[PDB]
Design a protein around this ligand. Structure first.
Ligand code: MG
Ligand code: MG
Ligand code: MG
Ligand code: MG
Ligand code: MG
Ligand code: MG
Lengths: 49, 110, 52, 354, 92, 48, 95, 143
RNA sequence: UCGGAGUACAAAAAACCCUCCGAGUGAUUUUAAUCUAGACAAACCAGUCAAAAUAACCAUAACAUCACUUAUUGAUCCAAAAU
């Protein structure tokens, strides 16, 4: 999903990337009142990154 | 009245698999109360006298001779009291194996 | 005649309690059981009485 | 509803009435003997023997072999009787039998076994191990002549090859010696073949040695057809069977099609059908000798593969079938939580869109 | 294996002594990982198993203890071929 | 500290184990011998 | 079950569902066997293991639990170190 | 490529002894209501007739593999008084040597509990052990 | 409430304020473990078996037995124990 967002230009690597620009690029949606504490990296696309 | 406790449902004891039915390992072939069908080849015995298939294959029902355990005193006494022309015959449940034990495949050529 | 229910505790130092029926007029019981935390054959003694 | 039996009942022969007059066996061993005698008869109902592979039951065995030796039965019986009487005549035999201390010369017992019933015993070992099935199919022979194969490991170490033995290829790397008793009036053919071990063809066999037109006992002076090759089983599949066959031939026969060259390492050239080869020369050869051994993989197989045959060595594995699972239900009822682990593909968390 | 210059000579010969079943005809030691779907994890397993092979051949205190449960058949059949082995007649 | 106390109790009670096993087996053996000898003495007294 | 509440006008849930049941995301419902803490000295080891096993719920029970459960508990949840996270999804279902 | 390098992906081994010596062959587990238990590859069968002594090594098919009997003339001119314990010793030693010659090293012997306490069967087992044949066959691999 | 026989004669099931036996536990040591294929049965709750795989002990050693053995038994919640 990260490589898909970067390759489609939703988020960029020239600027440091965080959860703010991830939400701004609509890659993840966080619901704090559902007591999410943030975003965990998962290793599904480790070979093609 | 005078007779009480006559109400009891059946325990569903009977024959489950026939001859020609294909079973896998662990399938209960028959359940029984006293020894009606005896286990034969590739058929296990549980402590409630149920017969379960040990190998995957086709169930057969067969009549052969009864040679009991010498440690079983009543059985060997029944053997002792038989006349000389008499042999015991009982019925047995077998499972003929269908699949082979395994195959040899080339995994690496060095 | 009545039986009593007695709790048996391990002598291997590990806490393991298992319940056994034993006859009331008999003495204190001591058996040889299996402890699944030590994986050895463990002597067990009668420690407490729970149920009549 | 009652039906009529198709043949006799087992226990209908004895009389039900007057049970006291009928003799009883009081021995469980007597019942064991009687039941094992009763179980071998072809009953008309469904039996274990019918279902569990009796290998066609009664089989008309075609015999392709040497005549049995004609020995006078009455003279043989009287000389055996006189030897037995002179044996029981001694008192020290009675002493050694009573005091539980007596030994027998097992080498002489083995020699008289090889002369007397060793052929029939080796025939039943070959029938059990399926030597006749994969070489001559329904045809069988009695290994009449004694035959001894031995492998020279070093100066004094000599490893024999008897019926059904087990020899490592380190012992069998070199050419063996073959010993059998024969006068100089006949011609012999020795053929060592590997019945299992052909790579491409499951119905074909390998030649490991072949020598033809052997004058008498002397194997070396016979004309050399196919070179000796060390045993090469696979690393995975073990216990290939190697058989030495000895044929008695009357005329001097030369082969132009069966001749193999001097190095001859090509396994396409080393491809055999013993059935068709005996079909080619049935009129000349009659099989008289046989000795076969099992053989598994060792470190000496690797050099035979690499240096001699120019091979990348194949390695096999014994792979069992996968365990059976039923069809997966959408709502399993009264099943453990591990029911999904039976049908899970791999133990890796996969995220489709996340 | 013969040109692997990052290991010592006794370790290099001992890997050929024990692990000759993994050695190709051209002198190539070949190691294979299958377990994980991720080839990075497979490579990490490869290097971990390679470290396990190197450490063992490099330790002179390794006595190479062999399990008896799978070797009782081999030991009994080894003694039993040694029974027929015992005859002494000179040959060749 | 709790794990080390558990390990010390395990090793301390395992260092005393076969002597406890043999003492309990010997105690039960002398109990059986005492009962059998009492029955033999009662039978020998009642037979006379 | 209160289908329409008096304060908010929403559909309430029964806490007796949550206090003993677990809902996976495939629709499957997980539960404990009845009587696993009762009379352990009397029952055999195989029976004790069978009562200690977790079990699933069938169709009618699962639909009853889904009807008595509001839509909060049917959401997708990503807990840290969740043992049932591996069991949340369904695979190889050929129906 | 090299012509000789061609190989089938699945190897067919037609030897019936391969699975038995690799101990992955199917034993006939089950029965239990009858005796003896038919879970074996090879079984030692001792028939002690009032005249002769006959020992067999039987496969589960019912065929005899190797037999040593005192009905044989080869033993018969070598022993005295065909019935003895010494005759059982001769049978045991001859069958142990024949089993070593035939390559069978494991078998199951299931004696009757009064035959187990007998003098002849016990020292016949002693002769089988000293002969090199190990009784009580090894356990099946993935049974 | 639970079990055995007939009713219900041959796979299963099958009722009556139908006819007869019982059970609400004793005795003994062999004190009877963990995990997991595949099944019987069943509305649900329950109940039954169980090969392979580990550890215990002959150093490749898992059925507690007998009394017609079949019944010898009770769900949540809550209380006391405390692991
Ligand atoms: Mg979310
Ligand atoms: Mg009834
Ligand atoms: Mg009813
Ligand atoms: Mg005669
Ligand atoms: Mg059903
Ligand atoms: Mg098991």
């Amino acid at each position: 999903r990260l490589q898909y967002l970067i390759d489609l230009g939703r988020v960029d690597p020239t600027q440091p990337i965080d959860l703010t620009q991830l939400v701004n690029g609509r890659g993840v949606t966080i619901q704090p009142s559902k007591r999410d504490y943030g975003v965990q990296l998962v290793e599904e696309g480790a070979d093609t990154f | 009245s005078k007779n009480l406790g006559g109400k009891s449902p059946g325990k569903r004891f009977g024959i489950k698999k026939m001859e020609g039915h294909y079973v896998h390992a662990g399938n209960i072939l028959a359940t029984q109360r006293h020894f009606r069908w005896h286990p034969g080849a590739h058929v296990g015995l549980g402590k409630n006298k149920c017969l379960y298939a040990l190998e995957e294959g086709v169930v057969r029902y067969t009549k052969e001779v009864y040679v009991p355990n010498p440690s079983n005193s009543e059985a060997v006494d029944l053997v002792t009291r038989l006349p000389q022309g008499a042999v015991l015959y009982k019925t047995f449940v077998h499972v003929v194996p269908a699949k082979p034990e395994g195959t040899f495949k080339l995994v690496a050529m060095l | 005649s009545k039986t009593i229910l007695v709790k048996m505790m391990s002598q291997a130092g590990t806490g393991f309690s298992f319940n056994t029926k034993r006859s009331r007029l008999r003495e204190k019981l001591t058996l040889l059981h299996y402890d699944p935390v030590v994986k050895k054959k463990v002597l067990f003694v009668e420690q407490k009485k729970i149920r009549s | 509803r009652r039906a009529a039996p198709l043949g006799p009942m087992p226990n209908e022969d004895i009389d039900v009435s007057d049970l006291e007059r009928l003799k009883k066996y009081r021995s469980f061993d007597r019942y064991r003997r009687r039941a094992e005698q009763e179980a071998r008869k072809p009953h008309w109902w469904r039996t274990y023997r019918e279902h569990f592979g009796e290998e066609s039951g009664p089989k008309d065995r075609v015999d392709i072999g040497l005549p049995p030796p004609k020995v006078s039965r009455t003279q043989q019986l009287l000389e055996r009787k006189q030897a037995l009487r002179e044996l029981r005549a001694n008192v020290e035999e009675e002493r050694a039998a009573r005091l539980q201390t007596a030994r027998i010369p097992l080498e002489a017992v083995r020699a008289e076994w090889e002369r007397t019933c060793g052929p029939y015993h080796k025939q039943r070992l070959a029938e059990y191990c399926g030597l006749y099935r994969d070489l001559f199919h329904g045809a069988t022979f009695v290994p009449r002549v004694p035959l001894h194969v031995a492998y020279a490991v070093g100066e004094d170490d000599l490893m024999p090859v008897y019926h059904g033995n087990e020899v490592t290829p380190t012992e069998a790397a070199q050419a063996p010696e073959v010993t059998y008793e024969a006068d100089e009036g006949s011609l012999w053919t020795l053929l060592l073949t590997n019945l299992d071990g052909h790579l491409l063809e499951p119905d074909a066999e390998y030649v490991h040695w072949l020598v033809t037109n052997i004058p008498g006992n002397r194997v070396t002076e016979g004309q050399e057809t196919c070179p000796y090759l060390p045993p090469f089983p696979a690393r995975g599949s073990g216990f290939h069977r190697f058989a030495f066959l000895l044929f008695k031939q009357d005329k001097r026969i030369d082969f132009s099609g069966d001749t193999r060259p001097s190095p001859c390492y090509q396994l396409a050239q080393r491809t055999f059908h013993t059935f068709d080869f005996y079909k080619k020369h049935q009129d000349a050869m009659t099989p008289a000798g046989l000795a076969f051994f099992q053989c598994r993989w060792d470190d000496s197989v690797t050099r035979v593969f690499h240096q001699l045959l120019d091979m990348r060595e194949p390695v096999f594995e014994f792979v069992r079938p996968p365990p059976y699972h039923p069809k997966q239900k959408r709502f399993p009822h009264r099943q453990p939580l591990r029911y999904l682990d039976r049908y899970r593909d791999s133990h890796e968390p996969t995220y489709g869109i996340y | 294996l013969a040109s692997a210059d990052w290991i010592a000579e006794p370790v290099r010969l001992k890997l050929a002594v024990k692990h000759k079943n993994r050695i190709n005809r051209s002198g190539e030691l070949i190691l294979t990982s299958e377990c994980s779907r991720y080839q990075f994890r497979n490579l990490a397993d490869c290097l971990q198993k390679l470290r396990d092979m190197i450490a063992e051949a490099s330790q002179p205190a390794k006595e190479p203890s062999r399990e008896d449960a799978e070797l009782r058949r081999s030991r009994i059949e080894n003694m039993n071929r040694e029974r027929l082995r015992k005859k002494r007649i000179s040959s060749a | 500290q709790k794990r080390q106390a558990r390990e010390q109790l395990i090793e301390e009670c395992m260092a005393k184990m076969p002597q406890m096993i043999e003492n309990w087996r010997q105690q039960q053996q002398e109990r059986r011998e005492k009962e059998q000898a009492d029955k033999d003495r009662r039978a020998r007294l009642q037979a006379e | 079950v209160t289908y329409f509440s008096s304060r908010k006008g929403k559909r309430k849930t029964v806490k007796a569902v949550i206090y003993r049941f677990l809902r996976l995301h495939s629709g499957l419902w997980l539960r404990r066997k009845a009587g696993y803490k009762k009379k352990l000295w009397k029952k055999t080891a195989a029976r004790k293991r069978r009562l200690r096993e977790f079990v699933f719920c069938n169709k009618t029970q699962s639909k009853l639990l889904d009807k008595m459960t509001t839509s909060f508990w049917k959401r997708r949840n990503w807990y840290a170190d969740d043992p049932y996270q591996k069991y949340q999804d369904r695979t190889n279902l050929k129906v | 490529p090299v012509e000789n390098e061609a190989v089938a992906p699945e190897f067919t081994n037609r030897n019936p002894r391969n699975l038995e010596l690799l101990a992955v062959a199917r034993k006939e587990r089950g029965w239990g209501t009858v005796w003896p238990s038919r879970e074996f590859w090879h079984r030692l069968r001792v028939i002690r007739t009032q005249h002769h002594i006959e020992a067999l090594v039987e496969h589960r098919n019912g065929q005899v593999v190797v037999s040593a009997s005192t009905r044989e003339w080869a033993i018969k001119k070598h022993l005295y008084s065909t019935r003895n314990v010494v005759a059982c010793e001769s049978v045991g030693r001859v069958l142990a040597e024949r089993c070593l010659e035939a390559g069978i090293n494991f078998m199951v012997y299931h004696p009757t509990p009064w035959e187990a306490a007998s003098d002849s069967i016990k020292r016949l087992q002693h002769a089988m052990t000293e002969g090199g044949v190990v009784l009580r066959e090894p356990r099946r691999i993935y049974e």
